Amino acid sequence: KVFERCELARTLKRLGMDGYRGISLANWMCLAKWESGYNTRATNYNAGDRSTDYGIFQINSRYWCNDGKTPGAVNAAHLSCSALLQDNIADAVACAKRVVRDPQGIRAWVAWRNRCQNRDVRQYVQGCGV
Ligand SMILES: N[C@@H](CCC(=O)N[C@@H](CS)C(=O)NCC(=O)O)C(=O)O
Numbered sequence: 001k002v003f004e005r006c007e008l009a010r011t012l013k014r015l016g017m018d019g020y021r022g023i024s025l026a027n028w029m030c031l032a033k034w035e036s037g038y039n040t041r042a043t044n045y046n047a048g049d050r051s052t053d054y055g056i057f058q059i060n061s062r063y064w065c066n067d068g069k070t071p072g073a074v075n076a077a078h079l080s081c082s083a084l085l086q087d088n089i090a091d092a093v094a095c096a097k098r099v100v101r102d103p104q105g106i107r108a109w110v111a112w113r114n115r116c117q118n119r120d121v122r123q124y125v126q127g128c129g130v
Contacts, residue, residue, distance in 0.1 A: 001087040003038040003056075005029075006128035013130045015093045021100045028096075029124035030116035031109055032056050040092070041085055055084035057096045058109070064095060 003011070009029055012018070018025040035058040036042035044053040051062040051070050061067040065081035083091040099108055106112050 001040050003032075003040075005038070005124070006130075008032065008038055009125050009128040009130050011089065012093070015090065017093060017097070018130070020097055021105055023100060023106050024121075025130055026121040026123075026125045027106055027112070027116060030119070030121040031106065031112050033124060034111045034115045035109065040087055040089060043085070052081070054081050055092050056089055057084075057092055057099075058111075059084055059092070059095055059099065064099065 009025060012025055012028055017023075017028050032038055035053075036056050038056065040056045042055060042058065044058060046052065046060075049062070051060050051073070052067060053060050054065060054067075059065055059081075061070040061081050062073045064077055065079045065084055066073065066075075066077040067081040079091065079095060084095065086092075100106055102108065107117075
């Protein structure tokens with residue numbers, strides 16, 4: 001599914017992402033925009049390390065979800081990567097909150113650093129009523 005901007009914003013609000021581990025809703029919005037353009041079916045194969053990024057948040061199969069074909073993903077995850085390609089983003093959100101529980105926080109996504117960090121991200125939530 002390709003979300004509309006404000007439709008996603010209200011959905012993330014409801015799933016309790018606003019201020020999760022100090023990260024504002026505008027920051028998660030900024031992240032989804034640059035990673036997948038708000039598309040839950042987005043997939044990116046990394047030929048260099050043979051891993052794949054999945055879904056709206058582009059979560060990687062080496063440490064977070066299991067897809068079986070990634071080398072050195074030596075078990076660990078238990079969530080199937082397939083769960084991150086659903087139209088319902090509940091699992092993807094549960095997973096993104098897991099990721100930021102680590103020290104790096106939102107900085108774990110290099111796209112966040114390139115495109116959102118130290119920037120005015122208010123634009124992503126402007127007019128959504130959240
Ligand atoms: N490799 C890390 C993270 C693996 C991990 O927690 N993945 C999450 C998805 S982001 C998961 O499998 N949750 C599935 C579940 O617990 O339903 C660990 O084992 O702590």
